[PDB]
Amino acid sequence: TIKEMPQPKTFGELKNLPLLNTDKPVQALMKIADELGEIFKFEAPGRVTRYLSSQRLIKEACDESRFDKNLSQALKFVRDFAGDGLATSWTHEKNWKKAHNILLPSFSQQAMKGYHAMMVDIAVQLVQKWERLNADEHIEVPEDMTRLTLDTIGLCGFNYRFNSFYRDQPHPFITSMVRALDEAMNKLQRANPDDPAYDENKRQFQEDIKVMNDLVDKIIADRKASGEQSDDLLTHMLNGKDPETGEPLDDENIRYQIITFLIAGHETTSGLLSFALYFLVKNPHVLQKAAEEAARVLVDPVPSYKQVKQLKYVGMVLNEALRLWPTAPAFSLYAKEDTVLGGEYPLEKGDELMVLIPQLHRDKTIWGDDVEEFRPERFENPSAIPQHAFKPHGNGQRACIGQQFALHEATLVLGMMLKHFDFEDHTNYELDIKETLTLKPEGFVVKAKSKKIPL
Numbered sequence: 356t357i358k359e360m361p362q363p364k365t366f367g368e369l370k371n372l373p374l375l376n377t378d379k380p381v382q383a384l385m386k387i388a389d390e391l392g393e394i395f396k397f398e399a400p401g402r403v404t405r406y407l408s409s410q411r412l413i414k415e416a417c418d419e420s421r422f423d424k425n426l427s428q429a430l431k432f433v434r435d436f437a438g439d440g441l442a443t444s445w446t447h448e449k450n451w452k453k454a455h456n457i458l459l460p461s462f463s464q465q466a467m468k469g470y471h472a473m474m475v476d477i478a479v480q481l482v483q484k485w486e487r488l489n490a491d492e493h494i495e496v497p498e499d500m501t502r503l504t505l506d507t508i509g510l511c512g513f514n515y516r517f518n519s520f521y522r523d524q525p526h527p528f529i530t531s532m533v534r535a536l537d538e539a540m541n542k543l544q545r546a547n548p549d550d551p552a553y554d555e556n557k558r559q560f561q562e563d564i565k566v567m568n569d570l571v572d573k574i575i576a577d578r579k580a581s582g583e584q585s586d587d588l589l590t591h592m593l594n595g596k597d598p599e600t601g602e603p604l605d606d607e608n609i610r611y612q613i614i615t616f617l618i619a620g621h622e623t624t625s626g627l628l629s630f631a632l633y634f635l636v637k638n639p640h641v642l643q644k645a646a647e648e649a650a651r652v653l654v655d656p657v658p659s660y661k662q663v664k665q666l667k668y669v670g671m672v673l674n675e676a677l678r679l680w681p682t683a684p685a686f687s688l689y690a691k692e693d694t695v696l697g698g699e700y701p702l703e704k705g706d707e708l709m710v711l712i713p714q715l716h717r718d719k720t721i722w723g724d725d726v727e728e729f730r731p732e733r734f735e736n737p738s739a740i741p742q743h744a745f746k747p748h749g750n751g752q753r754a755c756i757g758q759q760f761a762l763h764e765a766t767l768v769l770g771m772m773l774k775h776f777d778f779e780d781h782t783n784y785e786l787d788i789k790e791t792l793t794l795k796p797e798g799f800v801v802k803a804k805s806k807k808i809p810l
């Protein structure tokens with residue numbers, strides 16, 4: 356039953372590339388999926404991939420015996436500053452499994468318990484900032500969520516204070532990062548990146564890369580000379596030994612891991628929190644239910660690790676926000692061997708796939724007719740959800756290593772926001788999703804009304 360797969364409109368020798376000439380390429384690709392269905396071919400000069408949108412096909416793509424992680428063009432461009440750190444290495448590169456073995460214990464339960472106090476440090480700064488707003492001032496949500504998540508990975512992971520809440524403008528790092536990511540997303544559609552029209556982009560790309568590397572130097576300098584005894588992510592990077600190869604990470608790879616974790620360790624969690632608050636103010640009944648949980652569980656001025664673990668409904672709220680708007684919206688795979696997808700689409704060894712996660716999460720055959728509704732109760736029973744229906748953290752051994760960190764931070768912070776404030780969508784905000792490879796609301800503002808509960 357070999358089928359012929361659809362393909363969106365082409366532009367001569369540029370093939371489908373100009374379809375990416377937009378500030379919202381993932382959303383453009385979702386619209387193409389709406390029109391073409393669960394699978395479509397997408398070509399650019401010298402490259403073919405296939406976008407998958409249905410759980411029917413993606414459950415086969417998640418078979419690690421048949422498919423391995425591929426570096427998308429986006430990840431290849433990010434590799435220009437993230438090197439062979441965990442997220443931009445091939446599975447078969449020595450440094451992938453070696454760093455994985457070394458850094459996995461930094462996300463154990465016992466590690467999470469160790470990060471918790473510093474997580475609270477930053478969360479309290481967020482709550483205090485909002486308690487200190489004047490009447491009828493408002494909250495810039497993604498901006499403040501990015502302050503929080505950047506500061507949290509800096510402090511918990513590296514004992515470094517970005518002090519983002521002492522800045523009215525984004526930290527230098529954030530500004531460069533967003534620009535490197537902008538450049539990487541915009542470079543996706545460039546048919547001739549060597550055209551001298553892009554010489555300034557190339558120069559600016561290097562400038563932003565040094566800014567990001569300078570902080571990495573300072574983070575490493577401060578730890579090596581410190582007199583304090585740390586046990587955090589940096590500690591493991593500098594001292595951990597891989598059981599398999601027996602070797603620690605070398606200095607060049609450590610630097611790549613720091614860049615990787617500073618970016619991956621915050622940018623998507625700030626998007627998650629922004630989307631979760633958006634859906635909560637648009638769904639007051641859900642907000643109330645999660646606020647009731649927050650009030651019942653967070654009975655102390657400072658949340659404890661054990662209490663965050665009991666914010667189970669807040670946890671479902673976050674999962675449902677990742678369902679509708681997974682903030683890292685795609686991942687890529689290649690066929691390890693010739694194989695047939697869905698009994699219908701033969702693939703040759705090396706053939707590539709793109710998993711379009713926001714579209715997967717809208718598969719009506721899985722979620723039902725109410726698929727656009729925000730119903731955290733969808734997640735009450737993981738056993739009732741078919742395999743590989745829900746993939747906001749990627750797949751298999753290349754799934755997100757930071758998943759527990761992200762969800763613990765987001766549950767703590769959202770729990771505290773719902774404990775301490777009522778929220779008002781005072782502008783009737785119209786969701787507008789900015790793309791920097793990752794996804795985040797833009798211009799989302801709310802007003803908080805303090806419940807006047809002491810910290």
Ligand code: HEM
Binds near residue numbers: 749754
């Ligand atoms: C809600 C927040 C987050 C989301 C949605 C998310 C999502 C993802 C996804 C989809 C991947 C797979 C990428 C691929 O297959 O190409 C991934 C990989 C990764 N994530 Fe996350 N992530 C989040 C938070 C974090 C945090 C906080 C950290 C660091 C503490 C982190 C570190 C990583 C790393 C290192 C990888 C590469 C893993 C490997 O291949 O060994 N992520 N993440």
Ligand SMILES: CCCCCCCN1CCC[C@H]1C(=O)N[C@@H](Cc1ccccc1)C(=O)O
Binds near residue numbers: 427430793
């Ligand atoms: C933090 C998450 C980063 C990974 C998500 C990247 C997700 N892309 C970000 C923009 C759109 C989306 C994507 O579909 N990209 C493809 C684009 C592409 C396909 C075929 C030929 C050329 C280029 C790619 O990069 O290969």
Ligand SMILES: C=Cc1ccccc1
Binds near residue numbers: 433437442443618683
């Ligand atoms: C570079 C960071 C990153 C984080 C999540 C998915 C892919 C890449």
